Design a protein around this ligand. Sequence first.
Ligand SMILES: *[C@@H]1O[C@H](C)[C@@H](NC(=O)[C@H](O)CO)[C@H](O)[C@H]1NC(C)=O
Ligand SMILES: *OP(=O)(O)OC[C@H](O)CO
Length: 159
Amino acid sequence: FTLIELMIVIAIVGILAAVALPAYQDYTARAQVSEAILLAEGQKSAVTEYYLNHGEWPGDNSSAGVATSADIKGKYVKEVEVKNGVITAQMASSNVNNEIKGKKLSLWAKRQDGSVKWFCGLPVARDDTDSATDVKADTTDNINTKHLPSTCRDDSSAS
Ligand SMILES: *[C@@H]1O[C@H](C)[C@@H](NC(=O)[C@H](O)CO)[C@H](O)[C@H]1NC(C)=O
Ligand SMILES: *OP(=O)(O)OC[C@H](O)CO
């Protein structure tokens, strides 16, 4: 070889040293959001029991029989709230991935003639406590669909 080959080798080493990386931030965000999903999954029992025994959805945390919103906290979850039958979880503002800072996701259920189905995805709000009221969509501090698992990507019109 000659000096040209050595210079080419050095240039190739420099090229390999600085290369672009894929978006692992989305994967880390999904891993962190899984914790909030698990935390919100544990409040289904009280809501279901209240609906079955009273015939209408619970109004707030106190009526359902769970702790206050500011007390249901985890490593990456700030608060979990129940309002008219929907469970919304809000992330924290520090020591959390930048893409899911201050975002929310919601869980809600619909009653059928022989089963009760549960949905998970973007934030959703209900108007009153009636058992047949539909669910609208909320557009305040909404999480992005790229930070959620493929299973938890439901819409407000799902039935
Ligand atoms: C239990 O949840 C109920 C929906 C709520 N009731 C009402 O808001 C209306 O009275 C329904 O006609 C209760 O206030 C809740 N109980 C509490 C907060 O202790
Ligand atoms: O936890 P809670 O349902 O009391 O709500 C906390 C929040 O500050 C009120 O929106």
